[PDB]
Amino acid sequence: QFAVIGLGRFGGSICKELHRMGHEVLAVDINEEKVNAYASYATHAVIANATEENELLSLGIRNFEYVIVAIGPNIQASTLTTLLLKELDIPNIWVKAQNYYHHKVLEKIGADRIIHPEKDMGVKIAQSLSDENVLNYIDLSDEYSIVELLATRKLDSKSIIDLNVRAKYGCTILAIKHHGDICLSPAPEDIIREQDCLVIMGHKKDIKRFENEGM
Amino acid sequence: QFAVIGLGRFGGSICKELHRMGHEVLAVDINEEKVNAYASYATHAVIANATEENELLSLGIRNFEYVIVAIGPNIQASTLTTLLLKELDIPNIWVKAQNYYHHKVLEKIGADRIIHPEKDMGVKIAQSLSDENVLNYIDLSDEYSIVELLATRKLDSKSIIDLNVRAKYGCTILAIKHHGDICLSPAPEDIIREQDCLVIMGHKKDIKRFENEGM
Amino acid sequence: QFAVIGLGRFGGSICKELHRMGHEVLAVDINEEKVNAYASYATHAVIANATEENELLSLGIRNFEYVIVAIGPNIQASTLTTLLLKELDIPNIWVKAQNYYHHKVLEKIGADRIIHPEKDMGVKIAQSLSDENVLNYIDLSDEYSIVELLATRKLDSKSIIDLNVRAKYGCTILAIKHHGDICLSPAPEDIIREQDCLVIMGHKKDIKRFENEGM
Amino acid sequence: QFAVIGLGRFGGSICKELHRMGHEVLAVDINEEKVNAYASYATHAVIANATEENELLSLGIRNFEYVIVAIGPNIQASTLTTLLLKELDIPNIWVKAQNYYHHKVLEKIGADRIIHPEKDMGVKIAQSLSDENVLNYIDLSDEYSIVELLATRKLDSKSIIDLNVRAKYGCTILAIKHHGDICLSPAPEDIIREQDCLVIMGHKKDIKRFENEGM
Amino acid sequence: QFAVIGLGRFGGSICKELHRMGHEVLAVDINEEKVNAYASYATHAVIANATEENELLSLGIRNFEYVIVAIGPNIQASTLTTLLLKELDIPNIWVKAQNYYHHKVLEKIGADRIIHPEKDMGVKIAQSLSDENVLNYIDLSDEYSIVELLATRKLDSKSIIDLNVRAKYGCTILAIKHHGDICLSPAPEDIIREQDCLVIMGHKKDIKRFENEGM
Amino acid sequence: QFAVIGLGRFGGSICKELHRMGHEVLAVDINEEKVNAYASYATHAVIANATEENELLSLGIRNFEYVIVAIGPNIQASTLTTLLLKELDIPNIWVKAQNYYHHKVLEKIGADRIIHPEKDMGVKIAQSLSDENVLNYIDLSDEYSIVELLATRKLDSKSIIDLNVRAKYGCTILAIKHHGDICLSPAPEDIIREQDCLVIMGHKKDIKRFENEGM
Amino acid sequence: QFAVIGLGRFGGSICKELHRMGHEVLAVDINEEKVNAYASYATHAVIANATEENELLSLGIRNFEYVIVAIGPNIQASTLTTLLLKELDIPNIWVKAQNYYHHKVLEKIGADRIIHPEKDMGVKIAQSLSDENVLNYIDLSDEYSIVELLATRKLDSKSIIDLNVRAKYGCTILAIKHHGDICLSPAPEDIIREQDCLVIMGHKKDIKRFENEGM
Amino acid sequence: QFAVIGLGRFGGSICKELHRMGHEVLAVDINEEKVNAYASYATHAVIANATEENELLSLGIRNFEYVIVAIGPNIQASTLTTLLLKELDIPNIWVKAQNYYHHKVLEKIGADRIIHPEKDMGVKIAQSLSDENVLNYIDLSDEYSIVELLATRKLDSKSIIDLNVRAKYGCTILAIKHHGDICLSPAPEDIIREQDCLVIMGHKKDIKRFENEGM
Numbered sequence A, B, C, D, E, F, G, H: 001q002f003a004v005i006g007l008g009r010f011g012g013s014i015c016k017e018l019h020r021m022g023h024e025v026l027a028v029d030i031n032e033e034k035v036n037a038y039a040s041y042a043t044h045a046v047i048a049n050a051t052e053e054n055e056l057l058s059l060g061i062r063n064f065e066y067v068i069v070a071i072g073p074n075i076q077a078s079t080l081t082t083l084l085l086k087e088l089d090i091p092n093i094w095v096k097a098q099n100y101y102h103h104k105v106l107e108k109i110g111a112d113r114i115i116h117p118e119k120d121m122g123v124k125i126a127q128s129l130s131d132e133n134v135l136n137y138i139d140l141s142d143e144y145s146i147v148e149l150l151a152t153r154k155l156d157s158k159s160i161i162d163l164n165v166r167a168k169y170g171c172t173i174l175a176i177k178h179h180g181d182i183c184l185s186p187a188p189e190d191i192i193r194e195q196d197c198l199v200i201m202g203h204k205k206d207i208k209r210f211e212n213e214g215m
């Protein structure tokens, strides 16, 4: 169902995680050591030169609905492999881009999805660092978002009804994680202790306001 | 306030994004072309070898609360710089890891946060790939998460009270995005049309169950 | 001014002819024997892998306004070379296509002109053999053309005013070549002897008619 | 009437085009897929080894006036087949040459015409390259020729009587192609717009002069 | 009397051996180093392209009764030269064949003898591996042959009258070579010691029988 | 029992002939086309790189008593393969040599037999040329040999007792092949007709004498 | 007393030699074949992952005064192990360095001695190549050294009092090795024959002078 | 004058040092990063596969008197390179060996010197560790050596005439290094302070005795 062509920092992780989720994955790599190392982290693992189409045919690459092209240092191999896969009518081809150029040519040669892993992780890191409180988040839209927060001393021993976010800031608390224990959709009587995870939901500026005055 | 030591695919993105957000960032790089290219995407841009202590002193690296070590292909510059920075009492040192090892030695030499961009983006892509429906998500913990979904035909013209997720699956719907318009914490009378964004919250396996039988 | 990347049956001819015309041409080839053989048929001759970018940089390939990619047996090397050249902002990139696919991908990766030598030669030869008389020709458009013909016995000792092509077929005679001697824009009194070259100009179907009934 | 022995890039084109012109063609090929692919582009299509005499006899190869030997990568099949055909008293044997040698031995073993498709296409393209404007041409002799030109801005909105080529350069304009529309033997009042096709006729050097000072 | 056109692994050996036997040989080669190296192993040695007729005339190739064409890597030079030699009415033309094809076209263009050295050496080596004992042999017919054998322990100190091959196996012993000393048509009293050469003559199967039970 | 590692002009013939004799042979070749072509001419045929040890182990090369290493274009692969086989304690390793050097290094790395096909065939052809008559022969020693001759008119209708070779020249007639029919150890009354095969045995110079005066 | 953690080209030799000298050594390796191979060349041999702390504790690694970290293929095992050992208060940790980096991080994480085997052996061999005569040497300081020299013809049959190095060049001869026989601190009457070992001692530039004018 | 084929831990150091000494060195490497990194540490630096003969010819490798083969991970490439160099009549070929086997085969294919760097460093460390005083040493022969020592407290304020090594142990003191200052061939009145460098010369076992009872 899934094929990973490059078993490196990026593709190897995709393979390992897909395998961990319970899906069947065929891992490909030109380097024998990589193939051997991911033998336990994949349904099948094969040594093959991705630059030769007949080898791809030998892999039975057409039997897959999703083929992942994760070759980083070599743009040549990346775009060429993507091309060969595009020849074989692969339904979905996802390729890692190195730069603007790579993104462009992959875009033109019919890549289904082009990923800039470092960049996207970068915006995650940037938002996570800009305000020390947010551990993680998800953007529902340009204006609205759900935010995971690290409780400070200002929130210690404070109740949900005490911190009336639903009216004063128009945001809503979703979950509280305390010492690994978790509380989903907590009742107003619940207490928030410091260093705990607080899951708020609402408008970005409003969340920023609550962060400002509340914590 | 923030310093980016490696201006590559990863660090360059962090610098550019931080600059876009309005924060002041000092970009460092041993390659002159990189420094020149990021002159417009940073408050200041300097050519310097991060492995040389006197150069670090010349940068005024101690004046920063956050220093990001993002050097990928060469572990040398990364761990050595991290070490030198740990000597200079940098409050927060965030470093990009290449493998299990890099993570280990960074962990022991006092790295405040170790990032595996390819790995985490890898698992994100993996989750996004396992189900085409999930557009984005956030993990509250090892077991609990909030998931953004792309509504299918099975969910078309269905009401929230019709899809009783709060009891049948123990999950809760948070938001519905329809043609760009957005509905936060929607009432049970609200209708979900296909191709819309559906924000569910709960246990991973339970959300998967709802995905299986519901949509 | 001109660069030939593949010194084979096709590209080698381009190089040799361009050199014969008096233009300065840099010939490239991965095969040393080929490079040696075309040393006398080029301003400069270099051994280089067209698939390696730095080698292209070493060639000073950017200093050329026209670079010809003539690699036949390997589609990989062809599209790859075209790609690398497209990176280096080469003004005009002309590439040999092997098949429909090759034409497509070259088209998408920004090839300025795509040549099917076999095909065009095929149609030229097809028109040349279909009619025993046609020695050569040029197509002005999809419908109109100028045709060179070999005079038969039916045309022997016939005058231009006798063979009134300007009215009977709407075509015009341009030149008559007799025993090597040549007559341009001949007067109606001129005589056409057999085995001579006759240059007619007009519509294809009309020329075919004149061929059918006249000669 | 016509037989094509090699259905490749070259011979396949000859077969397809000949079939398109309305002539009856028998296509031969050692490869079954090729034979199948040209079933629709030929009167008949047969699987046969051109190096085997009895197979040639089985084809009824003697019933043809023109047999085309187009086998490229393998000189063996080409010269051997040509030889067998010369034995069977084939009226016209046309063979594709790979190099100087192939031309030589085909010449000696009684080939009626030896074709270097890449070479001639090469010189055609070469003349097309020396001047960007010339789209096509025909040489009447060593000194005289008819040339098709691409009108530049210098020729825009210019009349034929304005560009007095018949006296100033001794050349004559034959046709003007404007937006696909075509004008044969145009009157001096006619206007030439840029990017149009201009058909001049005369001496090579004179045409070059007109190209130089005029456009 | 003898001319060697290709001074390689094959032709060079022929030249050297013919020269060693006392015959006068003219060695030809396009490579100067070869010509220099075979100067001492030939009556005369000349640098010449065997594909050029005027050079062949300059060699005085017609003055030779035997001309050997030994060019391996290039089928071109071989068949073309053979052709030119056939034009010049050379009495005997012997050419080395590369494959079935080379044999075919040489056969048709009037080669006096076509040699497949590797192949015939192949059957000799095949017999040499098939039987541990035979040092050399000659086939009189499809069924009858003369065989040279290496004496084993089973033949040590055995007399000819002891090994009655003329009646028991119907074969006849011809010669015995002992420590370089040689005995032709030996008398029945003669002794055969091990590691000596034994020359038997008769039917193949019978010789095999004698090998089986005797030695 | 027998393994052929290089399926070319030399090794392929060894394989084919060994197979023809009825022995079981495993053919190896890195080129798939070669392996396919010799599938019918071998017990088993495998695609394998002879320079790779694990592949050799996969072949079960140790199960063979005779392994033939025949490499023409690449001396490296030859000596390396011979080396690996010598490591695996192969009883008999026979290798084709390209030159003196190759012979030396093969000699030192423990090659069991080194064959120069061109050389030996060269001297055989040389003796075949020295005398137009000799069809075949075998050398018993440096001075003594058995020779096969093509009878001329001088020997026509001559009896063995008429041509007293046993006394006048000290050589002995062994066999006469007459119209394909064969006579072994013929009686003195037997007649020799021209164009028949005559098998003489004796001293080289004496045989030459008999050729001189007799035929 | 001594523990060798990596049994490769470097560490294996250390273990074998230390064992040969009579010291007790515990050899460690993650590879079972290596551990088995060095069972006879060590007091004890154990299979263990040097990156796993509990395994190190199981080894009783604290009971050793000297632990050698020689792991080649990856910096990971080396620095991580060195780190763990520095944690466990190992008295002496000597580690093989891969590059400048490895040296740096080992230096900072408290490595007692960092070895560049290739670097030092490389510069020694380099000295052996720059001057063919010097077989070996040792540097007492930046300026002074003892050098072993290979006697040339210029030194043949020369006496020590003849070559007054102690006064003319300020260097002193220490030993003369002749045909394996050795003379320590030789008297001025002793003779030096060519191809013998000559042990000089003094200033580098002075030794170079003596080499220049003397030999 | 010197060529380095492998720019790794070993060969790279040789190149750098040879360049540092003032000699001209041509550095070769199949990896571009290595070639670029050693551009400043060599007269010339080239990307080339050492296993390809024509590339070696292109390098002008024959123009060198010394060619160093330093390729570690691939024994194949090593021996093949050594082989090709042996073909080109290179005067001196020095190769790094990986193991006993490699040493053997390099020995047989005509390697001029075979180096095991790690082994020698291993034995050096082995001698250096039993007694901390030995910093370094040199073996004059199997039995005799010169040793550099670190003076202990037992040697503090002791005179040369006090420590009569020339008679009691048969060894001779050569030099004393005190605070960086150096004394060559010191007089018996000279004093040795602890932790100073003491250069002894004599028999290995005797030196060991002196170390045991004396220091």
Ligand SMILES: Nc1ncnc2c1ncn2[C@@H]1O[C@H](COP(=O)(O)OP(=O)(O)O)[C@@H](O)[C@H]1O
Binding pocket: A005, A006, A007, A008, A009, A010, A011, A012, A028, A029, A030, A031, A034, A048, A049, A050, A051, A070, A071, A072, A073, A074, A077, A096, B118
């Ligand atoms: N030509 C090729 N064919 C097949 N696989 C390749 C080729 N080139 C590189 N790879 C594989 O791609 C991987 C690249 O990994 P890496 O450089 O870490 O990229 P990323 O950072 O995207 O993971 C390597 O593990 C390598 O085995």
Ligand SMILES: Nc1ncnc2c1ncn2[C@@H]1O[C@H](COP(=O)(O)OP(=O)(O)O)[C@@H](O)[C@H]1O
Binding pocket: A118, B005, B006, B007, B008, B009, B010, B011, B012, B028, B029, B030, B031, B034, B048, B049, B050, B051, B070, B071, B072, B073, B074, B077, B096
């Ligand atoms: N010692 C050093 N000092 C300063 N900058 C360095 C040093 N080593 C590497 N760099 C810089 O770090 C950058 C690494 O970027 P890149 O390889 O793209 O990392 P990633 O792939 O993680 O984005 C390079 O542009 C380089 O200039």
Ligand SMILES: Nc1ncnc2c1ncn2[C@@H]1O[C@H](COP(=O)(O)OP(=O)(O)O)[C@@H](O)[C@H]1O
Binding pocket: C005, C006, C007, C008, C009, C010, C011, C012, C028, C029, C030, C031, C034, C048, C049, C050, C051, C070, C071, C072, C073, C074, C077, C096, D118
């Ligand atoms: N990667 C490459 N880099 C440079 N030159 C190449 C490469 N691959 C092939 N070539 C050259 O291209 C030529 C191919 O010529 P050929 O196959 O005859 O094409 P055509 O039939 O169009 O002339 C060869 O001579 C070869 O040397």
Ligand SMILES: Nc1ncnc2c1ncn2[C@@H]1O[C@H](COP(=O)(O)OP(=O)(O)O)[C@@H](O)[C@H]1O
Binding pocket: C118, D005, D006, D007, D008, D009, D010, D011, D028, D029, D030, D031, D034, D048, D049, D050, D051, D070, D071, D072, D073, D074, D077, D096
């Ligand atoms: N012996 C043969 N008999 C018949 N057809 C052949 C023989 N050998 C080759 N062919 C055909 O000739 C074609 C060669 O085409 P190709 O190599 O593309 O030539 P070119 O490059 O000149 O177009 C192949 O499709 C093959 O099927």
Ligand SMILES: Nc1ncnc2c1ncn2[C@@H]1O[C@H](COP(=O)(O)OP(=O)(O)O)[C@@H](O)[C@H]1O
Binding pocket: E005, E006, E007, E008, E009, E010, E011, E012, E028, E029, E030, E031, E034, E048, E049, E050, E051, E070, E071, E072, E073, E074, E077, E096, F118
């Ligand atoms: N056109 C030619 N004219 C003369 N000599 C030639 C020509 N072409 C090749 N040769 C010679 O033939 C030799 C080929 O030898 P080789 O390849 O070893 O053949 P073989 O393996 O049959 O001995 C080369 O040394 C070359 O000098």
Ligand SMILES: Nc1ncnc2c1ncn2[C@@H]1O[C@H](COP(=O)(O)OP(=O)(O)O)[C@@H](O)[C@H]1O
Binding pocket: E118, F005, F006, F007, F008, F009, F010, F011, F012, F028, F029, F030, F031, F034, F048, F049, F050, F051, F070, F071, F072, F073, F074, F077, F096
């Ligand atoms: N490294 C290798 N491993 C295995 N087979 C090889 C290798 N290199 C070449 N070969 C095979 O050897 C054959 C070469 O045969 P050829 O050059 O005809 O030798 P000969 O002239 O002795 O017949 C090729 O068909 C090729 O498949």
Ligand SMILES: Nc1ncnc2c1ncn2[C@@H]1O[C@H](COP(=O)(O)OP(=O)(O)O)[C@@H](O)[C@H]1O
Binding pocket: G005, G006, G007, G008, G009, G010, G011, G028, G029, G030, G031, G034, G048, G049, G050, G051, G070, G071, G072, G073, G077, G096, H118
């Ligand atoms: N994590 C580990 N724990 C223990 N031993 C290891 C580990 N990783 C590698 N080794 C051993 O270290 C040895 C390294 O040898 P080698 O690669 O030759 O290094 P070098 O070239 O520095 O001598 C290998 O034999 C391997 O068995």
Ligand SMILES: Nc1ncnc2c1ncn2[C@@H]1O[C@H](COP(=O)(O)OP(=O)(O)O)[C@@H](O)[C@H]1O
Binding pocket: G118, H005, H006, H007, H008, H009, H010, H011, H012, H028, H029, H030, H031, H034, H048, H049, H050, H051, H070, H071, H072, H073, H074, H077, H096
């Ligand atoms: N086939 C090859 N041709 C040329 N250079 C090579 C080849 N294979 C490896 N190399 C080079 O040899 C070097 C190997 O060095 P390394 O593995 O560090 O050995 P060592 O540690 O003994 O120096 C690498 O830098 C690599 O670029």
